[PDB]
Amino acid sequence: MLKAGVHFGHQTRYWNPKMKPFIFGARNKVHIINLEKTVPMFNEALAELNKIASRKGKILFVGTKRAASEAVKDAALSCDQFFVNHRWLGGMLTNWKTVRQSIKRLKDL
RNA sequence: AUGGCUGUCGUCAGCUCGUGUUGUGAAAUGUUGGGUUAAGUCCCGCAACGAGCGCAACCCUUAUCCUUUGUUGCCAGCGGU
Ligand SMILES: [Mg+2]
Ligand SMILES: [Mg+2]
Ligand SMILES: [Mg+2]
Ligand SMILES: [Mg+2]
Ligand SMILES: [Mg+2]
Ligand SMILES: [Mg+2]
């Protein structure tokens, strides 16, 4: 059921109290996420993703420059998948009508 | 009361607008930060992405060379001198 068991992690500060229910603690000299309360979560996330996937929904994966970089690179690239690897321009989805002028620039260029 | 025209800050590099976002609001952001430049000139970063007026560049003159033309300008090679 579990996808590997390697979640050693490194974060040791700034635990958000709002997400207490999903945390175990003890190990890490700080904290750790509960592995039992995550098997029944992503197994749903995918269930919901499938619906939009049907009408070839635009997922638009996100990872900012060095956040993933070597972790994602371009594995997102597929038949009907898109991604943002470089800096996520501050406020581009909300003013997409303003980013059309720049996407046209990229196309013409 | 004005049109038109002109002086000065000042040939200093600044002054603004679209959408976006933040704030109850006047407003802020961008336009600030790290470098650099004669310059809001350019690069990186960034809650902003673009654009406009301005700076530079297009203009004239000057400093080198080449093509054409050779008088009313010029005289290197030759001659009457
Ligand atoms: Mg508001
Ligand atoms: Mg200013
Ligand atoms: Mg301002
Ligand atoms: Mg600066
Ligand atoms: Mg400029
Ligand atoms: Mg002679």
Dist. CA A46–CA A11, nearest whole Å: 27
Q: Provide the CA A108 to C1' B51 distance, Å, integer.
A: 18
Beta partners for residue A83, in sequence order:
A61
Q: Are A60 and A83 in contact (CB under 8 A)?
A: yes
* Closest C-alpha to A72, from A59, A62, A81: A62
Q: Which two structure tokens, joined as six digits, stand for A40?
A: 């029944």
Q: What is the resolution of this structure in A?
A: 2.6
| DSSP for chain A, written as a single string | --S-S-------S---GGGGGGB--SGGGS--B-STTTHHHHHHHHHHHHHHHHTT----EE--GGGTGGGTTTTT-BTTB-EE-S---TTSSTTHHHHHHHHHHHHH-
- For residue A99, say whether its CB is under 7 Å from any atom of strand B: yes
B strand bases under 7 Å from protein CB: 18-21, 45-50
Q: How far apart, in Å, are the Cα atoms of A80 and each of A38, A59, A107? A: 27, 9, 19
- Residue whose token pair is 């196309």: A107
